[PDB]
């Protein structure tokens, strides 16, 4: 795997007391062969040596497994009386193959939230580490949400800004398709695909922002060489900051 975009970092700017997520993009190196990215086989490690944080494997979920029909028209927004179904997985056709991708991390998060909620409902998963809501009133009735890490994001629906609050239990990573991915259902990144990797921080690692510190991420698939990513992080300069 090659790192094939900048590394983005998000914090409670300008206050800088708390850490939200990191995002970056990967693709198979030089287009030579495919990479298995299934989270049962692959590990993603995260270390911040200066502060003694060392996580051996945070990778848990992938939207590469998910067909568009499992997520599209399945989360919905209420605007007064009116109710609007969302499209989250976009798709296009070339040479009789359907390519699948998410246009941004926000639609990927909503698609993941739904997928995990559905896996919990089906008894396949014990608890979701991620919980996304638009209504903050609910939180008073769910005290476990009081203490875990929370960040917000906004989407436009019917030209109206909708704010979502994402509650994260523990630091975890997930992957999703960005381009060149016709293999929906498979967890395999083919040569000439682009895969988004997103790390969400839980209350442990979130506790204060990375400053004057080295952070290292490593992705290790079951075959082939691992990708090692390292950045010395200066102070974050905006809501999102470019670190690498």
């Amino acid at each position: 795997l090659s790192l094939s975009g900048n590394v983005l970092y998000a914090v409670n700017y300008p206050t800088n007391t708390k850490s939200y997520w990191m995002y970056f993009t990967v693709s198979p190196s030089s287009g030579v062969s495919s990479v298995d990215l299934s989270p049962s086989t692959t590990a993603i490690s995260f270390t911040a040596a200066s502060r003694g944080v060392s996580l051996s494997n945070i990778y848990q979920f992938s939207l590469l497994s998910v067909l568009p029909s499992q997520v599209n028209n399945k989360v919905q927004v209420k605007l007064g009386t009116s109710i609007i179904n969302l499209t989250l997985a976009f798709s296009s056709n070339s040479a009789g193959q359907t390519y699948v991708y998410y246009s941004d991390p926000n639609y990927a998060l909503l698609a993941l939230n739904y997928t995990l909620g559905q896996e919990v409902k089906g008894g396949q998963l014990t608890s979701s580490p991620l919980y996304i809501i638009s209504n903050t009133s609910i939180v008073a009735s769910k005290p476990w949400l009081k203490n875990d890490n929370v960040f917000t994001f906004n989407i436009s629906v019917n030209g109206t800004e909708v704010e979502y609050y994402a509650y994260v239990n523990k630091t975890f990573a997930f992957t999703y398709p960005v381009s060149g991915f016709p293999l929906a259902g498979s967890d395999i990144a083919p040569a000439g695909s682009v895969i988004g990797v997103m790390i969400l921080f839980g209350p442990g690692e979130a506790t204060n922002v990375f400053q004057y510190e080295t952070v290292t991420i490593q992705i290790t698939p079951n075959i082939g060489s691992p990708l090692t990513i390292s950045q010395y992080i200066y102070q974050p300069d905006g809501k999102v900051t470019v670190i690498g």
Partner: protein, 49 residues
């Protein structure tokens, strides 16, 4: 006779080469990213005043 001892050494030499391949690619990915970061910091250093 020889159709076996040779095969074992071949297996071992393949694994030996694969181990160097594994290390070389990983370390190339690492160092080239250090270079990317350095080039950015050089431009920041020349621009900021």
């Amino acid at each position: 006779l020889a159709g076996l001892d040779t095969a074992i050494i071949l297996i071992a030499f393949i694994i030996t080469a694969a181990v160097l391949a594994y290390v070389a690619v990983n370390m190339g990915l690492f160092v080239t990213q250090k270079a990317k970061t350095t080039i950015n910091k050089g431009e920041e250093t020349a621009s900021t005043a």
